[PDB]
Design a protein around this nucleic acid. Structure first.
Length: 22
RNA sequence: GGUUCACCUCUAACCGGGUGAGCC
C-alpha cells in the first residue's frame, strides 16, 4: 500500500529475503 | 521551528531505531 517510503520498500525486501533466508 | 522529499535498518508483523537533502 501507497508508501513509496524506504520503510515499505525495505519490508518488501525483507519478504524477498524470507524466500532466501538460508 | 514549520514544511516537502529522498535513503537505511529491527520483525512474520505491529510497536520501534537511524540518516541524507531540499523548501520556507
Amino acid at each position: 500500500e501507497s508508501k513509496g517510503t524506504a520503510k515499505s520498500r525495505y519490508k518488501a525486501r525483507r519478504a524477498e529475503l524470507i524466500a532466501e533466508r538460508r
